[PDB]
A paper describes a structure:
We solved the near-atomic resolution IHM structure of human β-cardiac myosin-2 (CarIHM) via single-particle cryo-EM using a recombinant uncrosslinked protein preparation with ATP bound. The dimeric cardiac myosin construct we used comprised two heads (human β-cardiac motor domain followed by the lever arm with human β-cardiac essential (ELC) and regulatory (RLC) light chains bound to the target HC sequences IQ1 and IQ2 respectively) and 15 heptads of the proximal S2 coiled-coil. We thus obtained the high-resolution structure of the sequestered off-state (IHM) of human β-cardiac myosin at a global resolution of 3.6 Å (map 1). The nucleotide bound in each head is clearly ADP and Pi, which are trapped after hydrolysis of ATP. In the cardiac IHM, both heads have the lever arm primed and their motor domains are highly superimposable (rmsd 0.7 Å). Their structural state corresponds to a classical pre-powerstroke (PPS) state (rmsd ~0.84 Å with 5N6A35,), defined by the structure of the motor domain from the N-terminus through the Converter ending at the pliant region. In the IHM structure, both heads are in the same conventional prestroke conformation, and it is the interactions between them that slow their activity. The structure reveals five main stabilizing regions within the asymmetrical IHM: the head-head interface, the coiled-coil/BH, and three interfaces involving the lever arms: the RLC/RLC, the BH ELC/RLC and the FH ELC/RLC interfaces. The head-head interface is formed by close interactions between the Mesa of the FH head with two BH actin-binding elements, loop-4 and the HCM-loop, as well as residues on the surface of the U50 subdomain previously designated as the primary head-head interaction site (PHHIS)20. The unexpected head/head interface variations are related to major differences in the orientation of the two heads of the IHMs: when the CarIHM and SmIHM are aligned on the BH, the CarFH is rotated ~20° anticlockwise compared to the SmFH.
Author numbering:
A (entry chain A): 3 to 202, 214 to 624, 645 to 906
B (entry chain B): 857 to 898
C (entry chain D): 39 to 195
Amino acid sequence: DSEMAVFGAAAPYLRKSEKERLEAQTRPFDLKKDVFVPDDKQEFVKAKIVSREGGKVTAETEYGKTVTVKEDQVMQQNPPKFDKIEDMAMLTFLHEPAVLYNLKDRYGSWMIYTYSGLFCVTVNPYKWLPVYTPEVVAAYRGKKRSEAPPHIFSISDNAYQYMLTDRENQSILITGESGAGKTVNTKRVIQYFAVIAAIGGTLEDQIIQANPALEAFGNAKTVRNDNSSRFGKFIRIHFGATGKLASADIETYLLEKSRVIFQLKAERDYHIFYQILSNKKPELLDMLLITNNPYDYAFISQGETTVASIDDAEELMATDNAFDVLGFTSEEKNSMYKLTGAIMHFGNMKFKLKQREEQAEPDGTEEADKSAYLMGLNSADLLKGLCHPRVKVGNEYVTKGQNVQQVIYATGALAKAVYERMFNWMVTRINATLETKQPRQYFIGVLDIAGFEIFDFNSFEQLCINFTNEKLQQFFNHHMFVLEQEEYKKEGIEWTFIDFGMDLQACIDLIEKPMGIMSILEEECMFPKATDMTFKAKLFDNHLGKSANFQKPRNIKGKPEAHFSLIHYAGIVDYNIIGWLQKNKDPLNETVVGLYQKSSLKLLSTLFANYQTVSALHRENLNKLMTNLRSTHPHFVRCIIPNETKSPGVMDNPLVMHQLRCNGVLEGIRICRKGFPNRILYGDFRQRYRILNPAAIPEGQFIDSRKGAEKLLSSLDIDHNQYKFGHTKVFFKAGLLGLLEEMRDERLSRIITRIQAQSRGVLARMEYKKLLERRDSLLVIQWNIRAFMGVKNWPWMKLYFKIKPLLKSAEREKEMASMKEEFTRLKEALEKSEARRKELEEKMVSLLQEKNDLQLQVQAEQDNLADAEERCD
Amino acid sequence: TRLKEALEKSEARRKELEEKMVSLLQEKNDLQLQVQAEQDNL
Amino acid sequence: ASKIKIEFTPEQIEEFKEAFMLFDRTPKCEMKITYGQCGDVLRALGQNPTQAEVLRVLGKPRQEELNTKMMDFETFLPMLQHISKNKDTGTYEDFVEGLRVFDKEGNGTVMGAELRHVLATLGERLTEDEVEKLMAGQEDSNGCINYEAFVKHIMSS
Ligand SMILES: Nc1ncnc2c1ncn2[C@@H]1O[C@H](COP(=O)(O)OP(=O)(O)O)[C@@H](O)[C@H]1O
Ligand SMILES: [Mg+2]
């Protein structure tokens, strides 16, 4: 409590007070009677053992219930000295009840950030704490994992320090179910980095405001979350060599296109639609000339129209401000709202049979005129194109006749496609604005995936999100369980393999791999003769009865019809095939496209400047993301939803226990204790650990790396049974690496206190000389003023000053003297500039040769991949 | 005047070389992204 | 702590008086100097102490006392003489040896980022604006700062 003076009012929400610790040590306990007992209603209950009759061990719960269980009572409690523990891996007893109740107590005390092993675990507060103030960031500058209480700022700082030290790109992966705070944590990490950069132009402001700009377009309200993330995102921050902020970029993934026109009963549409309808900006409502009532249009008024938790007016205000600060011009902004208004006007299209001849004609043209004007199109041409698409067969442009259903579906598909191109153009624009000069050196990438969801009606675009959640969870399993259990064998370290039982490949192979559900969806998507019912049947003839992940649909308690049950990692989902084929194909009206290319607005043209099934593209992007992640150091921040009813504070034990089981938080700590979490090379260890024991390593005695590391380790007072040695890697355990780092820290701390005293003394001396010369300059100014007072304005000096132009010989001589000294300055500038230019040019030649060779091998490997995929058949 | 012309030309050439090497960074990071793409291909 | 009346020579008294009058931040006064400014004057006048040392010699004052109450020139002068007599400073070889371990290959250069990090959050905490303004003019192209030139510039300046 003596420290934390810089944490401010957020202090009680980070680390428990000292008096609380003192009274906690006084808590009654037994350590031979206090146990945990499984429960049917709740998960686990504290209990005291009254008797142990052989196998049966009778105990009384904390609620007074008397229970017995078959050897499951051995589940033991923990001494009261371990409560609200920052690094949860330090528990003497670690198991499901222990982690569950530690998290429960912490959240009850409004303690959300915990360190579980090497990864952070955060529970959604549903109550905006003041823990995110800039004062907290200023306090978290440079703090280590144990020097600070758990927080997202400390995870970001650890990633930044690892990037600086290891000289490696870092990746902060945020994981969790729908509405678990992933967007909040992402924005907080961006805020941390941006304010750190702002400590020492407007790039930080732009990267901060980037998130709400995409919140308006892509973040809509669903059943689970009021600000749900429809599109996965990966925000990359390129840092310069100095460590100052250099640049940034954003990579976005598939957006739920069905949301634009179709919403379930409890859902809304994208917030940009309802933000304009709040009429906080009168110009938008009438320049769009759309009606204020949100129920007038059929795209955005099928489910819910507003949520009490969201106030759309200031949301529109924030969106406008973000667009303004991002560098967008007025024309672009106005055209974007114009296109959005066209999107909600497209829902007003009315089409009727011409002469009951299965041909569509515009029943109403006023809304068609609105849509045509908004893009600057031709209303007659647009209506003709929609009513009659001019598809070209062979070399003949044959007009196709379609009924009202086909034309209305075509209108919906046009709306979906144009809004998707809108979103992608926005992403490209923000990437171009943020990707300024010098994007050099290493990068830190924050990954925010779409959360797992189980609605009442599951279909396509709910399988891609669950699949990418499966994939990221499998990546976590790979980087924790499998990779280290093989680095143990590769390094020649005595280890026995442990079956953690968390490998999600059967489910992923059931989806991702060829012949899988989405693979056969892709292959059947090219067949116009096929229908959804047959395809579904195909699913039952190709995967059912062979894989456990696939299962027959459930259709529980009169829920909306489900077509097949997929056993994902987070429970069981049940999907419907109806509507998948057209969603995967995504056809578009070519004549309407050609109308788009010749529109008045340059914006609409650049969206459709040119016009690969969506499923394959999404799979390729996902695999690209995994390949990026495998080449970076991951920092996992797993998020947990406390309660499904969005009530702050309250936790239901079954839900949280299940999501910790599925996320693999528990089994990610066994390897953090039973294994060797820390590791470093011999050479780096000897190079940066010399001060610990310079006696064991004399100068110039760097004969052997392994022998040097061994004698440095043995020459110290630390425990020597903790570490192991292997080929160019020492394997630490627990906080031993932290111990060595802190002895190095204290030694180099004495040294650097001396150095910093010297440096700030020199700084004081130079500021002293600066103030001295400033005072001397002011003295010269007042001295000239004193001379002026001495002369004032007696006309004798007026005659003198009139004489001065007559006699300017000395002035001209000084003129040529300055001219020749600046001649010398200009000449030396010329030679230095020419030398710099020739160095730059030779670097250009070398780099362009290297990049041409790289492009050649790129083409060669692309052809090799094509040949390999051909041979895959 | 001649020296000023020479200096302005040299500074303009240095500035265009600076933006050119910025472009070289842009394309080199694009090429590392491409390299990642081939590692994805395998 | 202890105050000693006679630890000076008469000429340096005149030099220190000139330094204080020409450096006194407050213009309305001539003779008194801010309590927090006294440490800055002492650091600027050729001798460089540590924060702990300047706290110890100043009797362990408070930051409110630093920024509210004043000091007199000849009252602070004996402490200046004491600090000058202390000379708790290292040498070039010791400095470069201590700073050498901030590298992975011993090439004679160290990254600017790691140097900033260890200057800020490894010992006596340094204000950021200081860590940028001291490294201005000596930063290299890719951040690999030759520590020998850095320390020799520090001591020379
Ligand atoms: N630290 C937090 N403080 C306050 N509210 C939070 C916090 N973390 C999450 N929330 C709330 O949780 C809900 C879902 O957050 P969000 O980031 O949208 O989750 P996800 O990205 O997983 O869908 C929102 O209402 C948000 O305000
Ligand atoms: Mg989300």
